[PDB]
Amino acid sequence: LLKKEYTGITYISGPLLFVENAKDLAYGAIVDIKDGTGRVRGGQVIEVSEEYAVIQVFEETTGLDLATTSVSLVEDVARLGVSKEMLGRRFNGIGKPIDGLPPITPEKRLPITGLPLNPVARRKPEQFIQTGISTIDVMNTLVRGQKLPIFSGSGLPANEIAAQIARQATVRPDLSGEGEKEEPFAVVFAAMGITQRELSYFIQEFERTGALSRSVLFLNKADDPTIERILTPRMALTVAEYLAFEHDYHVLVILTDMTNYCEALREIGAAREEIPGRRGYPGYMYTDLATIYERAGVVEGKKGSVTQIPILSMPDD
Amino acid sequence: KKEYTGITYISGPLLFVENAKDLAYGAIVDIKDGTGRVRGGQVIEVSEEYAVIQVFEETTGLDLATTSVSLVEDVARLGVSKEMLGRRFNGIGKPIDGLPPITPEKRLPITGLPLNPVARRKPEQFIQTGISTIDVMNTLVRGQKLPIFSGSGLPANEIAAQIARQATVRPDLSGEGEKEEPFAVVFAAMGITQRELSYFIQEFERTGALSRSVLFLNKADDPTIERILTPRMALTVAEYLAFEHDYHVLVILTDMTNYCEALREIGAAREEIPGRRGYPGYMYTDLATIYERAGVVEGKKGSVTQIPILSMPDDDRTHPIPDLTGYITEGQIQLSRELHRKGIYPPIDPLPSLSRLMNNGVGKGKTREDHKQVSDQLYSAYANGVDIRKLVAIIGEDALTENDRRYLQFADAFERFFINQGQQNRSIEESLQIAWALLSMLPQGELKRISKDHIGKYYGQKLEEIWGAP
Amino acid sequence: IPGIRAQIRFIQQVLEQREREDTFRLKRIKGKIEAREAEEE
Amino acid sequence: MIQGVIQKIAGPAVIAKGMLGARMYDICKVGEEGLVGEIIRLDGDTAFVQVYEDTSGLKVGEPVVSTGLPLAVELGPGMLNGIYDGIQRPLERIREKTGIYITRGVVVHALDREKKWAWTPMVKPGDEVRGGMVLGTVPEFGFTHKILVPPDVRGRVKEVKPAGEYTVEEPVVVLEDGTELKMYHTWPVRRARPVQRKLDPNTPFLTGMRILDVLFPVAMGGTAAIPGPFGAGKSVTQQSLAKWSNADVVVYVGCGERGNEMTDVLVEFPELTDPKTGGPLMHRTVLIANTSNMPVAAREASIYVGVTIAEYFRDQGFSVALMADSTSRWAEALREISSRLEEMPAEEGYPPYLAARLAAFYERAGKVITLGGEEGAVTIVGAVSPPGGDMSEPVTQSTLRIVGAFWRLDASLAFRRHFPAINWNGSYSLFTSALDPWYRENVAEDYPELRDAISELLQREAGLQEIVQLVGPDALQDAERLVIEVGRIIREDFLQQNAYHEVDAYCSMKKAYGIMKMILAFYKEAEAAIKRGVSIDEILQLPVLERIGRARYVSEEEFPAYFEEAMKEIQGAFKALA
Amino acid sequence: PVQRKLDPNTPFLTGMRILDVLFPVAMGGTAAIPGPFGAGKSVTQQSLAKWSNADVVVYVGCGERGNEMTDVLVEFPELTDPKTGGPLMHRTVLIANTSNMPVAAREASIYVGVTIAEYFRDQGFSVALMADSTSRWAEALREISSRLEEMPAEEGYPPYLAARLAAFYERAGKVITLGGEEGAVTIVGAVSP
Amino acid sequence: TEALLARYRERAEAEAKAVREKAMARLDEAVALVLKEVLP
Amino acid sequence: ESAGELLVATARTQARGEVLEEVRRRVREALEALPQKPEWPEVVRKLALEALEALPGAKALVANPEDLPHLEALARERGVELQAEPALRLGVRAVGAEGKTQVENSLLARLDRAWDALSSKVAQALW
Ligand SMILES: Nc1ncnc2c1ncn2[C@@H]1O[C@H](COP(=O)(O)OP(=O)(O)OP(=O)(O)O)[C@@H](O)[C@H]1O
Ligand SMILES: Nc1ncnc2c1ncn2[C@@H]1O[C@H](COP(=O)(O)OP(=O)(O)OP(=O)(O)O)[C@@H](O)[C@H]1O
Ligand SMILES: [Mg+2]
């Protein structure tokens, strides 16, 4: 329960700082940076060696100095406290409540990166989801365990469609032939790079019809630190996986404006001075997006499911 | 005085000197070798261990055993005086006309201080360049920054020489005015060849325009640092004259493309990562520090006007140099290759041209009250004529209406008489008379953008008023 | 018009990518020069 | 204060040794002349400081001193009627003590330390104070300046000065902790000032222009963007916004303008008169000026200084309108700064974090409950100037993604002498639906439907332009020439507005509602008469055309009687017609 | 090792009219099928796996979706082998490495698949090797070379990419095995530009 | 009707107070448990 | 409709949060009451031992001067030095040999870092 401090800061430049004698910081760990005024900031170990360890600061580095700054280890792996009482709550995308209610009690703490599913453990998606929209339901039907994005534009009403799908989505167990009993359904809603106007619109849309009672919201504003935009879909998918594969829920995940996620990823990559891709985007963007999109699916021997509907705007159509 | 001899590295334009912490950053130094020849240099970096010096010209004879470095000046300064009028300089202030050096009244840093924005006032007076397409349609206002865009084979140097030869103020058109207000021209050439140098020298000497001019001439084979320094020295002289002796100065920068190329080379020689398309990232700031030294100051009677000239690298206005020039200057004048090949001089194309301060320097109490309307009508009529000229190639003349034929004739008359003035010098009144004579070709009532008063006062004159001696 | 505009847009992306690659190469070589001077002289 | 010496100089970059303990981004004074700069990198005992002005003439070994604080602004009485640069330097006093040039290393205070102010206490000893509370008031022209405790200060009042005359430096309140509170305080420009809660865009920002207020409205606390085409009358619209909009304080930011363009605005504003008081408009505005040849850091920090001052005045409980001119020039300065730092460009040479900075600037707007419990708002109208009108510029693409409105100013309308020259086809607004209840409660319950009908008529007129292009208008039959003529009537009598006229320069919402009602009623009766068999030329010379066309120039208080008279005349005329 | 390479003279019957008629491929040949997303690469390769006349099929899922491997694992045991009449899965070998699995393993999976194909060729069978996407293998090479801080070729790929691709594709062909029998390997590789 | 909302509010207050009292019936044992855990 | 059940749920959440924060306040009061009772020397010596075991190469031990006489016994045992500091109470800190690492063992910090896991455990106890 005790804590260890590192004070061998030797170099600060941009979003990076080097710690000298920290050989026991593991790769990928999460740390806390404390300055002379008592303010604390987060960081992650992106490279560790015998000479020094490299930490990327989660935000701006104003006020840090080599004489009074110290670094402490928070946890070896980034984790999130999850509970079934998260339904009907709102969070800021890093896991902290913003609806004015007390924090939840973690029934379990789970890593946010997750683990790949064994292809032998999967099963074929075979049941549909009724979204209430004729074109989708009839011609391009959504299936439990699918990932089906929406390709929007610069002035098209993507937000309205997202809110409508969130309100109207249902499971229709009666049509299944066996007339099975009603099954739990939930919606996990993640917004990245959202503005205040859209935030108010989404809040009122979820409050108006009572859909919020079955929903979990992760809302990230456009003026938040750029790291939080990276971690929002991962926390949303961690919550979705926990619900689906421990309580047999049929969860629907809606990720709004993944274009902002790509912009944040490009900013971070350019900060770490990596080799660029086709339009300045990092070369490993395919793998990074895959680690998010392939967390959906249906598992053999379990009744829950995870379905994703990414939403993005094609630049210049 | 004191000489430094701890040279430890020579490569290209750079040399390193040890134990030279007394050298201030940016200082000018003299480099001397075994044979006694002396070269110049500038300090581009200073450290506790060594200082880095960029050498002017070339390092052919240098060696690590006998070379020594001595200080010349901490800050690059130029000695200025009213005696500079009628003199020629090489771009670092060294006379090249063979006359004795001047005795300076003061020595000023060539890098200029910014003008306080609250000290500026609004430009409100025009300059008579003597060229119709400039005076009438793209008027140049005292204190404006109006560049000229030219091509590779176009005669921009001839236009520059003609403007420098003909430009003058017109105090007699502004109320009563004052008959005597000093006027001067500062001419700066960067990266020119011997042929252009001889042309400029002959043009300035053969007409007496040298008596009211200062020349800073930099050749193509001269060091590039001199090319960098030349416009700053020219603008320093211009500012000194205008704001200490109440002169009205006109500054002409012969080729800004050469300046940009020299800036790129200097930046690359110092190992700086280039910005867009290989040009330095701070290019916009440097161009702004050059251009923004013109203007008019409240409480002062002097003024500075700038006419940068630059050749578009591949006739592309999207190129970084013209693109960044557009953001800082008030309009542009664009030469046309088509008009040049047709035999028209000067080949100024009115349609892409624009002067953003024209509306303030024209009207009543300056030039004539019909100026703006006449210019607008000329613009519209010329556009209609050039469109009908393309249409007639397909549909034929007989299919045109009478008005279309008249517009077609108007366009040809405009090109032959208004633009193609040659070496002739025209006052503003002569240009307005020619414009009205050309407008008389069109029928009255088609002159939609001109009020009835001016139409009654001036319309109806025949082309023979200028056709007698075009 | 749309076809020529698309071709222009494609050529612009190609030239931009080449410029970015050249910038990256220059950055790497400058880093190597600085490291050599500052560590081995 | 950490003090050191210069070790290496290379252009704007200076390396100082002995600076252990210096903090990142703290402002430092370099050399004997005290040139200001920022610390951008810390390494061992050395710090990388980058100077704002030129470094020519410096020598190794000169002292370097760290102020220990980041870039900040002084907030207190004395900012109104002032003119500042991008780092809040009073240009008039610099001119007075220096001449026509800005010498390097000149030091002046943003707020005058000599002027006396009429202090009026509003607290007593023994009271408990928290950040944002009002300690007292000071008269500043027509405003009652509220002296606010800094947001991070809490404690108990020990002693308070009595009423009298004091400078901004005398401590008016002392706390039991020993802290002295003055009439001013400093705040970092890059940290947003705290509030209690952000409210929804429920109320409109009335600009006084009919087209903007009706077709493309912006809520108070919203954001808008406008292009900068030459000859389109952008400056006239901006100064009309300053004069007539219901904002209490106006902050104008010019970050990268040409010298003569800044001269125009610096000369024009001291002549405008505030219609509310009848006195100078300058008494309720703050000007930030930056030409292209000023230091890059000032040009980059200008918008942050402006928005910080706007946030302070919002925290005093006012409504503030902020106009940022040519944000493209700010983006250019940001690109240059990123290039000097050797960062990998993204897209068109801009740094990859351009969108993040633009969002951080624009998200500070909004209507809030201040820490003092009052209501205030900041509205941002930022100009964007693409290189040649290319809407695919990264700056324009990033800006349009976050703003709630976009007023596409057009040069073609100005060419045809249409003012304001705003293209109603390319423009859009996202505040109509949220603002509808305010319209239903404050102007009329029918108003949204009337506005929608006017927009539909405009769109119908736009849909026929193909036939009008291919064939002369008079060949079209009566019912379509009718919509052409009613669209012309709309354009001439409702959208157009002369800002130089004594009564037409400002138009209330109910006046626009009455004009729209008259126009729609006339159109309905005209269509009915056309179906009754009358010719269009018969309608084209009815007595009511002059009545509708002249509704613009009637006074505000006279308008209701004129409106009901014209409504009577509309029904009267169409009964005389067969 | 082999004894001798032979000139291919018999077709590789895929069961699709356009490929079998207009653009045939022989038993020892190689083919590439580039295309954008949604074009039909994976469906074509699965049709080749289901219906071709090869004795053994090796499927290499290098960097693709897991559902595509699950579909094979579920459906193939129910289908019928086109020639021997037994279950279809009894002639198939699957090497799977999905998109969210470790990146470096894609290069290993390619070589594992080709080596197993060569072994079954050495036993005298006719083998068809399906490579789901070589672009993911190229991306893995790019990432590894980026860690090594090597100077890159066009688009950040290492300069030796073409040599690796040529070495991989050269393993196909109809040969006389060391044991004196006859076998062949056919390689069809999808590309995702 | 507003009466349903009032009834729900009264039920909510009653259940919240009941939960608070039930918790007060266990507080000291929980505190002892926390001190048992946190101490070495 | 759900507009009533939501009020019940939010009231329950508010009550549970108030209960947990009251438990936290009682816990912190009980912890800060420790130095006034004779249980402190053993727990502070155990915490100092834990801190010294966390740093194999620890050089010096740092605590408030009140605890120095009790930590003298550990100082004689492990051979490390001791010095006074107005540090956080209910714990002892140590300094590594190089001077770049340091461990801290205050009890309030232990509560802060253990409450996240103890909350779910005590929630069942409360209900
Ligand atoms: N709202 C208006 N009402 C009446 N006249 C107007 C209005 N707006 C513009 N004008 C007229 O049209 C002209 C617009 O052209 P001008 O070039 O002067 O515009 P500007 O305001 O300086 O802006 P810009 O910098 O975009 O050119 C004004 O000078 C004025 O004569
Ligand atoms: N031969 C075919 N017959 C019928 N439908 C086909 C055929 N080929 C492709 N399709 C349809 O096209 C869809 C996409 O094909 P496929 O899954 O093979 O794409 P792919 O080229 O492998 O793309 P990706 O890059 O996404 O992996 C299939 O799901 C199916 O609906
Ligand atoms: Mg596929």
Numbering used by the authors:
A (entry chain E): 3 to 319
B (entry chain D): 5 to 474
C (entry chain G): 169 to 209
D (entry chain B): 1 to 578
E (entry chain C): 194 to 386
F (entry chain I): 81 to 120
G (entry chain J): 61 to 187
The authors write:
Cryo-grids were prepared using a reaction mixture of nucleotide-free V/A-ATPase, containing the regenerating system and ATP at a saturating concentration of 6 mM. The reaction mixture was incubated for 120 s at 25 °C and then loaded onto a holey grid, followed by flash freezing. The V3nuc structure, obtained under ATP saturation conditions shows all three catalytic sites occupied by ATP or the products of hydrolysis (ADP + Pi). Since the hydrolyzed Pi is clearly visible in the ABclosed of V3nuc, it is assumed that V3nuc is the structure before dissociation of Pi from the catalytic site in ABclosed. In the V3nuc structure, where nucleotides are bound to all three AB dimers, three distinct but associated catalytic events occur at the three AB dimers simultaneously and these events are coupled to the first 120° rotation step of the DF shaft.
The V1 domain of Tth V/A-ATPase (A3B3D1F1) is an ATP-driven rotary motor where the central DF shaft rotates inside the hexameric A3B3 containing three catalytic sites, each composed of an AB dimer. When powered by ATP hydrolysis, the V1 domain rotates the central rotor against the A3B3 hexamer, composed of three catalytic AB dimers adopting different conformations (ABopen, ABsemi, and ABclosed).
